[PDB]
């Protein structure tokens, strides 16, 4: 829950099912 996290499309983002 961090607003300063990357708002763009990211290949290195979490590819899991994290809800």
């Amino acid at each position: 829950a961090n607003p300063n996290a990357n708002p763009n499309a990211n290949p290195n983002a979490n590819p899991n099912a994290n809800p």
Partner: antibody
Amino acid sequence: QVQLVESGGGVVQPGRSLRLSCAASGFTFSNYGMHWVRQAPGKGLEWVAVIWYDGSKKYYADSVKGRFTISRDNSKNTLYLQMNSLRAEDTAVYYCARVRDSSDYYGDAFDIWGQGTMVTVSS
Amino acid sequence: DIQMTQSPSTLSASVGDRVTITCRASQSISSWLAWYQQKPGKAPKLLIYKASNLESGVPLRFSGSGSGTEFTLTISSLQPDDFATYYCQQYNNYWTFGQGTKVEIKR
């Protein structure tokens, strides 16, 4: 030629509502998170809201939270900003800015800005 | 809420001078700092991102230094196109801007 074009600004009275739209072109609008930044007449820069690349996350400044609503249409390359219960202090020019692209965990600076749109709130 | 404080507020200089603008943060922001240039009526323009990196297409005479709470925008040799207002911005805890430094022509 990557550009951002704000529009929809005008003169409104207190309590009334207005809708701003910012049309993107030249790049892939669906891959970028967007911001709204306003600048009151003769003053500095103030942040309004941010939306994620897929609209899954939205954050607002405390000065507009509950009153403003950010949104986007990735099929028409358009960012929106719904301004409800407008106040006199909301009078400013409203810019839409693009977050610079990085593969890192954190967001970057605003690397592309629009020409702005003037919103005037006065009875 | 992080507050950014620029100094000076106004600055007179002639073409060819070395110009140094400082920007102070109310708390540590690591290197999450940006520098913008704005001319009257026009939009802001990204100059420096992440404290020191030069934005592509921005002339090399623009440098940025600093980390933590004290930062510096330096124009190594002022040019006639550089007379404008410069803003610093932190993007570590939400997004806040400084009040700006106006680079004026000296006579």
